[PDB]
Design a protein around this ligand. Structure first.
Ligand SMILES: NCC1CCN(CC(=O)Nc2cccc3c2C(=O)c2c-3n[nH]c2C2CCCCC2)CC1
Length: 276
């Protein structure tokens, strides 16, 4: 727009490029996302500027000019991926990990209550500020690391449970300082999940053998010990995590239910120490 002047390219998303820009009018710095334009979609996005939550990056404005679509979001100073890389030496403190997980579950609970899912949760689209907050951003070579199993198996009508899986993967990563399922292809992704949680069957996941991309020929791996998977997460944390990583989407814990888990008994809001 004629009112915004780009400062620098923040990066490349999947729905277009994102730029850090200054609003020549308000003088504010924002995150500018550049994407005729489908009308059905216009009404959709117009609905995003409506669902506001403390843990959802605010969509300040939606500019639709010359068949171009510009989404103006609030600017946050860092993403979780960066913070985690900067904390690789000692890891993010548990209290802060617990605080971020809680906040993200809150944002998700809100999203899901309005039948809105993220679909592509990952460290790169989780934004944080100096205050100690974390927010969901960029709603739905792309990473497959946080992709839920029903998605990898071809379920077209997946549920809000896919976001819980992704968050579960992010939660484990914050704790061990290592991606849980770092696949580099759908099948590799799938098998890495199978090797760790065991190949799903009709017993733990009824209806799994009737999934679009399910192959009767998939190898049959045994489920690995969870204490070996996510140490030194305490029993409450591992208990919560296992419930977020259930194969059966219907058995997987909901965001609202997860907030009441014992793990958050002693949850606080620590302030992050970050370099900008
Ligand atoms: N970490 C940046 C990559 C992942 C996220 N995308 C796509 C996307 O949809 N980003 C955003 C959507 C709404 C608000 C923001 C961003 C976004 O990227 C960003 C925002 N506010 N602050 C930032 C950055 C600050 C510097 C470190 C990287 C994040 C760009 C590449």
């Amino acid at each position: 727009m004629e009112n915004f002047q780009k400062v620098e390219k923040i990066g490349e998303g999947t729905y277009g490029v994102v730029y850090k820009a200054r609003n020549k009018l308000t003088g504010e710095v924002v995150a500018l996302k550049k994407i005729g334009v489908p009308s059905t979609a216009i009404r959709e996005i117009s609905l995003l500027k409506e669902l506001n939550h403390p843990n959802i990056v605010k969509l300040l404005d939606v500019i639709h000019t010359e068949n171009k679509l510009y989404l103006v979001f609030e600017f946050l100073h860092q993403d979780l991926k960066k913070f985690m890389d900067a904390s690789a030496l000692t890891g993010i403190p548990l209290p802060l990990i617990k605080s971020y997980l809680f906040q993200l579950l809150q944002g998700l609970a809100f999203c899901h209550s309005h039948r809105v899912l993220h679909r592509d949760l990952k460290p790169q689209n989780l934004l944080i500020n100096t205050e100690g907050a974390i927010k969901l951003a960029d709603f739905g070579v792309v990473t497959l690391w946080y992709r839920a199993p029903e998605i990898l198996l071809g379920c077209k009508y997946y549920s809000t449970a896919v976001d819980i899986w992704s968050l579960g993967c992010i939660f484990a990563e914050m704790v061990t300082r290592r991606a849980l399922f770092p696949g580099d292809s759908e099948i590799d992704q799938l098998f890495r999940i199978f090797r760790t949680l065991g190949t799903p069957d009709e017993v733990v996941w009824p209806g799994v053998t009737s999934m679009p991309d399910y192959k009767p020929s998939f190898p049959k791996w045994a489920r690995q010990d969870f204490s070996k998977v996510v140490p030194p997460l305490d029993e409450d944390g591992r208990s919560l995590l296992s419930q977020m990583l259930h194969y059966d989407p219907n058995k997987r814990i909901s965001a609202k239910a997860a907030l009441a888990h014992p793990f958050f008994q002693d949850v606080t809001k620590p302030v992050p120490h970050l370099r900008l």
